[PDB]
């Protein structure tokens, strides 16, 4: 054939891939964290938006820190060979480097490490997108 | 050839390092509202980094907090794109 260019990710696999949405709204009382009013609007918007991009969307609500880690581990052990990409959306309280399960915090590095090139071989060389709506500290931008 | 184990990740953060992030109890969060609108309008036209740049512009321009508490009133937000990608990403093909 003619000259070929390889500057764009291959996105014509049989499936676009998974879109995992973790929507944490209600937190255990002992944590002291408020209910995140409005987050269901976000979760519904994301579901429809990524549906129209042909992602296989899975919505999960109010997961503990243990449930977040097990979900990510299990998803990272699926066979993604027929999938072009992977997307994860996290909606929660947070701090720099941290997102909250309903009962306490999770290091973001623990979640993303499951998808490292050497730990999830069916996503090696494929784009892995993490979309994070959470605080990263307590500074305010005055503008 | 080996690949770095951190290659081919993209982190679309709602806010800059060290900062709060804003969520409206009626309309949803500033970042997710804007992200979905820009994906709806541009996913069949633009590369993903350029879509996220339009999200940055929309969050920075169209939102400002309203609060009875002076500490939290009249504040702004900029999201933060962190890319370890090695190629351009288009959601369409052919």
């Amino acid at each position: 054939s003619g000259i070929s260019l390889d500057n764009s990710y291959k996105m014509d696999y049989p499936e676009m891939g998974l879109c995992i949405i973790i929507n944490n709204k209600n937190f255990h009382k002992s944590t002291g964290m408020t209910s995140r009013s409005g987050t269901d609007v976000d979760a519904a918007n994301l579901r429809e938006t990524f549906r129209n991009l042909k992602y296989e969307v899975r919505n999960k609500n109010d997961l503990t820190r243990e449930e977040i880690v097990e979900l990510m581990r299990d998803v990272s052990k699926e066979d993604h060979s027929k999938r072009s990409s992977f997307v994860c959306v996290l909606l929660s309280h947070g701090e720099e480097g941290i997102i909250f399960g309903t009962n306490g915090p999770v290091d973001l590095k623990k979640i993303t490490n499951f998808f490292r090139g050497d730990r999830c071989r069916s996503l090696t060389g494929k784009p892995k997108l993490f979309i994070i709506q959470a605080c990263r500290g307590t500074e305010l931008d005055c503008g | 050839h080996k690949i770095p184990v951190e290659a081919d990740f993209l982190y679309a953060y709602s806010t800059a390092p060290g900062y709060y992030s804003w969520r409206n109890s009626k309309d949803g969060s500033w970042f997710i509202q804007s992200l979905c609108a820009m994906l709806k309008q541009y996913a069949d036209k633009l590369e993903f980094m350029h879509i996220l740049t339009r999200v940055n512009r929309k969050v920075a321009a169209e939102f400002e907090s309203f609060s009875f508490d002076a500490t939290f009133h009249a504040k702004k937000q900029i999201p933060c794109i962190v890319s370890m990608l090695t190629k351009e990403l288009y959601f369409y093909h052919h």
Binding site: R36, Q133 | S21, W22, S25
Partner: peptide
């Protein structure tokens, strides 16, 4: 408007 609330913070996360």
């Amino acid at each position: 408007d609330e913070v996360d």
